[PDB]
Every structure is written in structure tokens, then in C-alpha cells.
Amino acid sequence: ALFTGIIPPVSTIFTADGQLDKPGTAALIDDLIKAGVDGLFFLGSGGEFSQLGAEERKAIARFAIDHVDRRVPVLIGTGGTNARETIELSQHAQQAGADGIVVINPYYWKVSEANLIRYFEQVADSVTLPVMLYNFPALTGQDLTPALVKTLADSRSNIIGIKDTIDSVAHLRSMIHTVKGAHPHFTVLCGYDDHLFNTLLLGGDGAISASGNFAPQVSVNLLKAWRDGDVAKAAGYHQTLLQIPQMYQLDTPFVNVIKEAIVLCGRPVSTHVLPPASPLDEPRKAQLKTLLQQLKLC
Amino acid sequence: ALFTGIIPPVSTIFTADGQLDKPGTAALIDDLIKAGVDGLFFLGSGGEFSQLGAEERKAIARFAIDHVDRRVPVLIGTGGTNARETIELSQHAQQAGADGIVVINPYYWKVSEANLIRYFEQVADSVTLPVMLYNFPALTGQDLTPALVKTLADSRSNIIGIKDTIDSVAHLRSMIHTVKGAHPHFTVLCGYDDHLFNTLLLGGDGAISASGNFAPQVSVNLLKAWRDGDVAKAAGYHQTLLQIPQMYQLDTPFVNVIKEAIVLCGRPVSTHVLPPASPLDEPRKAQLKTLLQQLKLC
Amino acid sequence: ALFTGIIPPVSTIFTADGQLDKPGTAALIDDLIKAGVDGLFFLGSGGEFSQLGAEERKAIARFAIDHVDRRVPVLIGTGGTNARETIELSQHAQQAGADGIVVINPYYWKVSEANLIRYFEQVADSVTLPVMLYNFPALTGQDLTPALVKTLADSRSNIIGIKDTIDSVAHLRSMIHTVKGAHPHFTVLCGYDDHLFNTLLLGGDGAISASGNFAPQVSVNLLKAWRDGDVAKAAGYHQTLLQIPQMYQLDTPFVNVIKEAIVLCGRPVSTHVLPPASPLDEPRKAQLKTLLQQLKLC
Amino acid sequence: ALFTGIIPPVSTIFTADGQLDKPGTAALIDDLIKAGVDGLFFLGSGGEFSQLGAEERKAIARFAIDHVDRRVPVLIGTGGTNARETIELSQHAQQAGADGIVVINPYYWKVSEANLIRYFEQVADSVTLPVMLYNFPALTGQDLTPALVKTLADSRSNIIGIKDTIDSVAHLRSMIHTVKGAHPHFTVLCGYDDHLFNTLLLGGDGAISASGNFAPQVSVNLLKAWRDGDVAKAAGYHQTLLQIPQMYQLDTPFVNVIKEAIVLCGRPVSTHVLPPASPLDEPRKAQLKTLLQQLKLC
Ligand SMILES: *[C@@H](C[C@H](O)[C@@H](O)CO)C(=O)O
Ligand SMILES: *[C@H](C[C@H](O)[C@@H](O)CO)C(=O)O
Ligand SMILES: *[C@H](C[C@H](O)[C@@H](O)CO)C(=O)O
Ligand SMILES: *[C@H](C[C@H](O)[C@@H](O)CO)C(=O)O
Secondary structure: OOOOEEOOEOOOOEOOOOOEOHHHHHHHHHHHHHOOOOOEEEOOOOOOHHHOOHHHHHHHHHHHHHHHOOOOOEEEEOOOOOHHHHHHHHHHHHHHOOOEEEEEOOOOOOOOHHHHHHHHHHHHHOOOOOEEEEEOHHHHOOOOOHHHHHHHHHHOOOEEEEEEOOOOHHHHHHHHHHHHHHOOOOEEEEOOHHHHHHHHHOOOOEEOOHHHOOOHHHHHHHHHHHHOOOHHHHHHHHHHHOOHHHHHHHOOOOHHHHHHHHHHOOOOOOOOOOOOOOOOOHHHHHHHHHHHHHOOOO | OOOOEEOOEOOOOEOOOOOEOHHHHHHHHHHHHHOOOOOEEEOOOOOOHHHOOHHHHHHHHHHHHHHHOOOOOEEEEOOOOOHHHHHHHHHHHHHHOOOEEEEEOOOOOOOOHHHHHHHHHHHHHOOOOOEEEEEOHHHHOOOOOHHHHHHHHHHOOOEEEEEEOOOOHHHHHHHHHHHHHHOOOOEEEEOOHHHHHHHHHOOOOEEOOHHHOOOHHHHHHHHHHHHOOOHHHHHHHHHHHHHHHHHHHHOOOOHHHHHHHHHHOOOOOOOOOOOOOOOOOHHHHHHHHHHHHHOOOO | OOOOEEOOEOOOOEOOOOOEOHHHHHHHHHHHHHOOOOOEEEOOOOOOHHHOOHHHHHHHHHHHHHHHOOOOOEEEEOOOOOHHHHHHHHHHHHHHOOOEEEEEOOOOOOOOHHHHHHHHHHHHHOOOOOEEEEEOHHHHOOOOOHHHHHHHHHHOOOEEEEEEOOOOHHHHHHHHHHHHHHOOOOEEEEOOHHHHHHHHHOOOOEEOOHHHOOOHHHHHHHHHHHHOOOHHHHHHHHHHHHHHHHHHHHOOOOHHHHHHHHHHOOOOOOOEOOOOOOOOOHHHHHHHHHHHHHOOOO | OOOOEEOOEEOOOEOOOOOEOHHHHHHHHHHHHHOOOOOEEEOOOOOOHHHOOHHHHHHHHHHHHHHHOOOOOEEEEOOOOOHHHHHHHHHHHHHOOOOEEEEEOOOOOOOOHHHHHHHHHHHHHOOOOOEEEEEOHHHHOOOOOHHHHHHHHHHOOOEEEEEEOOOOHHHHHHHHHHHHHHOOOOEEEEOOHHHHHHHHHOOOOEEOOHHHOOOHHHHHHHHHHHHHOOHHHHHHHHHHHHHHHHHHHHOOOOHHHHHHHHHHOOOOOOOEOOOOOOOOOHHHHHHHHHHHHHOOOO
8 A cells, every 4th residue: 555556766966076967857846746756766786876975975865855855755765884874864854855765675684584684673763754665685695585574574563565676576575475475465576577567467566666666657657557457568567677687787886777777868967876886888778779679658 | 126025905884873983093003014925905895985985984084094094004904886986085195195005996887898998997087096906706706817917907007006805726826827917016906814824835925814904813823934944834824714714704785794803812892884784683693793702703 | 489488397207115106296287287388397496307317307307398299389308518428418409309408507517608608509509409408506606697598599500598597687688689679580588487478578588497397277268368469368368377376385396395286276187206205295285275274376 | 433544436437338347346356455445335426336237336335345345344325316226235245244334325316304314224233244325415415414313323223434525524523423412333434535624623534535536645644643632743634635626626527537447546447437438638637646756645
């Protein structure tokens, strides 16, 4: 029930000096809302939270929540390694008017299970907002297993969902059976574009995926088709989404690629990104372009 | 060769409210310098850099460098995921009087090899201090391979060493043969207590390891015995260091364990640690104590 | 394009003394062929090749080829760690009448790339039969990357396909774009049930998956529906396949589970399995049964 | 304590046609016994067990036991993935007069813990010989944890040791503390040359390592020096053993390297290896030679 459907992890647009580009972030927000998304997620991996300072993250969230102005539910990513900062950023998000926070597990130290449960319990106790967990074991080095997530949802009634970013049908399936089986309204969202369709067929709730920035219409139409019972139309959109993640191989981090994609699909924003990411080179931008053209996305 | 010998990663002592405990950190620094260490390293993993804000880190470094007062070479850990903050903290360290900085690879995104080389070169070019790399793949999920380290030392003459924190004889051997083979004065330090002896026999330069906090005499005497040609005496100290790391299994993070050991070995400092670390329980503190007694360290 | 469509990895039926159960394996083969499969694959992981001796494997292959009697194409798994034995089994297979061989990479030693290419080239040179590569990195510890596989298909014109057994959309998608892009008639089959549909939509050719033994009709009808352009009907069958692999968690190895399922779905065969696999306990058999009933498969 | 001290995993010498070279294997066995080793281990990873058929393995063990003629204790490696074959090879070893068997875990399927404990209990019940376990998780993909090993020693009184092949001080220390702490006469042997000294200082029992083939005097003298209380002398030998494993990087599998080193150090045996290993090229042979010369081994 909370935060279901298509919720893009919005890119943060920066100027050439690495300050928040308010007109470009605002235009991107407005494109997304006009495309019919179900909510917006700021300061996720795509939004570059890990390359920003805490004061910067507060300013971005505040701007973003204000610009959205309640048109769609807003989530703010408040996680990191500094747990005291995670509480600060989460309390700031609630005060600023966000609808929910998304909290990754600490990704430097892989803390013991007892420390990890305590960390999420404390973060959840610091706010009255709904809390979405964030699994990204390829970057964190520490999986949030279905059993662990179930124990968290048993322990705190404001822990109401998960963004599960993993290329694994078994992990999504098992997350759904174990957690939604005990908690029917717990939300399961996949973090990869090419798992949206399977997520839905498995009993999950939608996606928070990078292609939400530059082709939201494909995910939004997939979901609308699926909700209407037109499974073949849904499967047609899925065939596009199956191919999209090729582009993510172009660079790592690929936050540059997603911005270059937003431009190519018709929204001229500054593509600047924060170190240690770097501008995409021209030959790879052309490769991105041919991929987008083959998929009829620009 | 810069920063060789025994260089503890000093614990940061905090009060119950999580603020820097100045008298306790100072007492700890003084004990360590009296024990005959060759340098001090503040805000490494043991010093809890990843649970501290940037302004807290600057304050800690400033205090520590000031208290040390040039009695031994001082290293400051400046790394993180936010590269702009890395440059800020590194430039701050230089201006505050540090003798070198210690920079881990970004540990959220495992960035491409080209972004990674470009990150270290930018960090190096932001200061005129010597730079020590920090490899801790168990936590980062991205190894700094001997071939990669060699390429950084070939590219920047102020990248002069590495702290290699890995339980692997092969990795230390290869780091020494590959990098010290091209760069005879490049410093190789192990990050685990039980690899100090082998690092020395391999042609490496010493250790930055946690037991430096609570039993610096063991490492210090091992290096002295080694430098004196008394290999059997060195090997006797090694036998104690082989056993110490058992304690690190008592909790994760084990920064709490290191502080509880500082107290048990005779220095009564506050043992508070920052979340998501937590206080060590009384039964595990009793287990630590009986271990320190069996090793004759208290 | 050779060996496309639905090709079960057939269980080998054994008696209570661990000998080939000819009547039971024959009835299983017959059920499968009547179900409309496009081929049959004996002595894969599911047929227990790794628990059988070389003479046992020759006997089983000969029986199975003779029983099939050319009704559908027959593949024999001839791989292992003993490369001399792989050539013996492969030449035996050809002499006995098989239509192709399936060859995993060596899975004890992960051999260097040069030795690996040389191994597959020698195997491929030993027979005139088509050769299907078998990638199962969860078990082998050594992935057959799309680049490597392309190199092998460039090198030997009888290396014509791959069974790719990995819960990874990216791996499938990349195998298809890289290998089929250079070699349009190179066959890509997925080894997991719940990747069949995606495999088809990505441009691949079918599946060799365990549920082919006890519910072939689901895969067969999915392929038929897809080939007819009835995508929604295909997606219906996909919804069942998405759920089936839950049963594989019951035991490891789960070759017992597969045989227990064959019985439950209406083919009473001896379920004996070779050590170190063991009989499935009754509570887990009942668990399997409830999973089959929920999916309307018995 | 059974099977302690220096026990080489003997290379199996083959003729150009891949048959057992009896004069060369015999000469190698005699060289080893003359050098003062404490036992000999045939058909481990370096003896190429995984590239041999069962009838070949039997012939080799029979020959090797017979040649040794009880001058030193003899171990035979009997493991594989075919558990019925493991029992046949182990009962054959006993009947052929072996003193013990060495049994790796199944390395294709990583069987469930319950299947793994049953496997080892069944193998141990099939003979009245002592059984040494063999941990090689880089190749097996499944670690024998100290806890699991303790459970096996609690379960069967003829499971009396382990060959722990892993570049990990923690793994050795923990195997010693957990297993030898419950079972003081259980034998812990390391499988890598550069962990012999540490294994001894940790309370362990010796090494089964590749350099036993071509330079057994180094391990033999280290152990002698250690037993004599001349720790400095032991450490001098350790310094050579720290350097030897560089050569194992020359090829993979490196069984070819080990035989080229046997020749270079003065015993002219055939260096044929079984596929998928291959002959070492001349430039790498010249590299191995200069390494052996720098270490004063030829
Ligand atoms: C989330 C979206 C996921 O994690 C990306 O990896 C691409 O789909 C995010 O926070 O950026
Ligand atoms: C360095 C010491 C290493 O990393 C620890 O893991 C323990 O010896 C540090 O910066 O803490
Ligand atoms: C192939 C089928 C694959 O590998 C299994 O893992 C089950 O889908 C086989 O050879 O058994
Ligand atoms: C044992 C020795 C180990 O496993 C090698 O890796 C080299 O010391 C063996 O059986 O070969």
C-alpha cells in the first residue's frame, strides 16, 4: 500500500561549478510529474547522495520537496555511513515536508546483524514518516536478506517497504514471499528497469529505476497496461526495458549516462556530475544516442 | 622512505554525548609516543572516520596534530565517497600541520579504473604533502591491485606508500615486488597485526594495526629486535601478534573492542563509540580481558 | 540454428541399488517426447553426471540414445575435470548416435584463459558433432563470459550454442548481443525456468531447465504461444515458471526434488539419487506437493 | 597426533603418452624420503587427482604405496564429486596398504551442510584408516569452517586432521583454536608454503605444500630448527618460503610449474602434465629458473 508504482530516482541537476541547478532540476521534476509517475525519490544513488555533503543534501531535499509542492508523494534518501547524520537528515526531511525516507544499510563497515537491526530501529524511531529500506548489495557488500527485512517490518510498523536493487529473480521472488507473506501491504520495489515486469508478475509493487528519468513513459505505460489486464501490452513495454540497462555499462558511476540520456530524450539540462564521477566522452555519448534511437526513445 | 615503522591507527576518544574527549585522546597519544612508535595516524577505520561529519573530522585532526606537536610524524585520513570533501579535508590537513594524508578508495561506487586513477591524481595534486594509499578490500569491495598502485606511484611523485589491509601473504608479497621493485623507497605497511613480521621479512616497512593502541610495545619491540638482527626475539613478539586478532571477532565494527582493550591494558579512557557501532556487552568484555591476560598484555 | 526450443535436462532414473532404471528412464523419455519437447539432454547437472563413473555414463548415454531412437534430437553431457575423459565420452557419444554434446568448463581448477580456450578447441576437434557450451558459474566458480564464448564460436564452427545457467538478465542479454550479434545462428539457451520468457524476448532460443522433467507442458506451451504471437498467453505460462524455482531451495543438490516432483506430477518412478545427494525427507516432500498443487501442476 | 610435520603432495610423473612414469615417480619419492620428510601424500591437487580416472588413481596409489614400502607414512587422496567412487578409492587405498586417506569436500555441487556431514561420516565409516580432511575453498567454492571441522571431529574418531589450503592467517588460527582446543591431537596442516612458520607458531602441526617436491630441505630444516628451539634459524628458512609462491603465478594449473622446478633443482623427470593443464612455455621456464637461482635453490 505505500509508495507503489513508478517512482523515479531523480537525478540532481548541477551547474558547471557543481552547485544545484534549480531551473534544470525543476524542469526535470515537472517532466516526470507530467509523465504520470506515482512519486519522486531524491538523493538516491542516481541522485548522487554519496558525493554530496550533509548541508548540500538538506538544501537539495528542501528545494525538491518545495518544488514538488505535494503533487506526488516525495521520498528523500537520507542514508550513509554516519548514523548520527542519517537521523539528522531524516528528521530534516520530515520537518521539510517529505512523505517518506529511503535508508540504505551502512556500506563501509558491514555491521553485525544486531547492530544493523538496531541501526534501522533507531532511524525508524527518529521520525514518524514511513521508511523504505534500500538493498544494493553490489555496492554495499551486505545483503538485506528477505528474513532480515521481515524481522525489521515485524519490529517497526513505520518500516513499510524496500527498494531491492539486484539482478536476481530469486531475490525479488523470495523478498515478496517472505515479507509480503507476513505483511501484505509491505511494498516491494525493484531497483533495475529490466525487473519491473517480473516484479509485478511476482506480486511486487513497481520500480524505482534509472530509466524513470529519461523514459518514464515506458514504465508508466507498462504499469497502466498491467493494471488494466492488458498483459501483452505490458510485455511489449517490458521488451524495451529489457534492453535499456545496456547503457549503464558505458561508465561507472553511470550517473553521467543517465543525465546524458535525459538531454538526448529532449530535456536540455546541464549534465555536470560530482567527482569521482566524470563527464561522459563524446564517443560514448554517441553510443548512448544510437542505443536510445534503436529503442525509439529519442 | 617515508612513514616506515610502527604507526598506530589511533582510536578517537569520545565523551558520552559523542564529542571529542580531549583529555582522553591526549593521554592516549602521549602513551603511544612514550611507547616509541614511529608516527601516528588519526581518522583511519579504527579512528571512526566513516561515522564522523566533515567538520568533526577537521576538529579532530586539528586537535590531534596540535597535541602531537611534531614529536612524531602525523598522518590524517581524509578519504570518503565525496571527492570534493576529500580535497577539502586534505587541504585542511596540510594547513593544520599534518605530515601526510592517507586516502582510501571510494567505497560506495566501485568506480572504473580510469575514474579511480583520476580520483587519486586529483587528490594528490590538491596538496604538497606525501600521500599514503589505503587498501581495505574486505570493506571497500574494490581491491587496489599491485599493478594499479604501481601505475599511481609512476604517475604522481607524492604517492609514496600504501597501508595494505588484507589477510593475504600473496597480496603483501606482490605489492612489495611490483611497487617497491619499480620504486625502492615506496613504503609498504600492512594493516593487520599478525602480518607485521611477514611484511618485514618480505622487504616491506612496518604496520598500521589496531593493537598499536593498547599494546604498542609488542610491535615496537618486534621492529627494534628485527632492526637489531635478533630474529628470534622478533619472532617471539610475532607469536603474541599472531594471537591478538582473535579479539576483533567479538563485535563488528570492533572499534569498541579496541577501546575496551585500551582500558584493560591500563589507560582509563572513555570507551564510547559512534553509531552504528555499539557498546561491547559485559560477557564479551570479560572474554577480552581473559584473552589479554593469557597474552600477558595486562 | 541448432538445438533451439525446449530441451529438458532429463533426470536419470536409478533403482534402489543405484543402477540405471531402464523402464523408469524410458517411461520418462516417452512422457517428455509426447509433451512436445524439441530435444532431450542426458547427463547434465540434473541427470547427475558428476556423481557417475565414466563407464556408467557411457552405458546411460547409449541406453538413452537407443531408447529415443531419433524421435527428437539428443544431447549428451560429456564434461568433467578429466579432459582425456571428456574426449573419450564425447567420441563415445558420437559413435553411439548422439546429435550433439554439452560441455561445461573444468570446475575444479579454474584454468587460465589460454588453457580454457585450448580445452574447448580440443574437445570440439575430437568430434564432428555440434558442441553446446555449458556455463554454470555458481557451481564452476568460473564464468564463460560473452567475450570468451564469442572467441570460441569464432575459433570452431562446431561450437554452436550455450546453455547459460545464471540468475542474471544482464548475462543473458549480453551473451545474446555479443555472440549472436557476431553469429546470428549461435543458440542461446537459459538454464533456469524463470528466465525462459526473458530469454525469448531478448532474442534467445529457449531453455534447458529442470521443470522440463515434471511440467514440460508449461515451457512447451509458453514457446508455442510465443511463436504464435500470443504474448499474453506466453506471459501467463511465465507467471507459473516464475514460481517454480522455489522448490529448488528444498535441498542441495536438488536432483532429489526434481524426481519427487516427477512422481507427484503423475509418473511413478523410483526417486533414488546418488551420493552425496540424499532422499528428500517427508516433510519436504509434502512441501513440494503443496507448491505443485498451488501452481495447478498436480 | 597423526601425520604431523612435512608431508609433500607428491607430483605424479607421467610419460609423453600420459601414463605413469614409474622410474621417475620412484626417483622423486626416494629424493623426498632422503631429504627427511615425515610422510608422503599422493593424488592431492598437485598429484593431478582431478585429471585422472578412477582406475588410473588406483594404479598410481598402489605403485606409490609399494615403492615407499613403509619407510614413511603414506596418504592417498581419494576424493572427488562421485561419493560412491570416493568410498571405492578409499577402501582400495586401505587394502593397498596406505596409512591414511585425504578427502576434499565435493566441489561441483556445494552440498547442504547436512549432506556434507553425512558425506564425510560415510567416507570415514567405510575404512578403519585415519582420515585427513582437505579444505581448498579457492577451488571448491565451499569453505570447511573451523566449526564444521570441529563437528566432524566430534562425530567420528577417525577424522583426525585437516589440510587447510588458504592464504589466511585468521583461518589457520581459528581452525587451530576451535578444533585443536576441543581435540588436542587433531592435526592441522597448512597447504601453502608461506604459512608453515605461522602455522607452527599458532600451535599447528606442519605443511603439505608444493615446494616439498623440489625443495623439501627448506621445510624440513625449518621444522627441525623450530623443534630444536632455534627460532631465528626457522625464520631464515621461512624467508625463503615467503618468496617461493611467486612461481605459482606462472600458469594455472601450476602443476606444470612444480615439475619444471623439480627438474631445475636437480632431478630430471618428465614434466608432462594432463590436460587441461599444458606444458610451460620456455620464457616462463627461464623466469622460474632465475627465481630459483635468486633463492639459491639450484
Ligand atoms: C536507485 C535506482 C537504482 O539503484 C539504479 O542502480 C538504476 O536502476 C537509485 O537510488 O539511484
Ligand atoms: C587501520 C588498521 C586496520 O585497517 C584495522 O582493520 C585493524 O588492524 C585503520 O585505519 O584502522
Ligand atoms: C541443466 C539445468 C540447470 O543446469 C539446472 O540448474 C536446473 O534448471 C542441467 O544440466 O541440469
Ligand atoms: C596440496 C598443496 C596445495 O593444495 C597447493 O596449492 C600447493 O602448496 C596439494 O594437494 O597439492
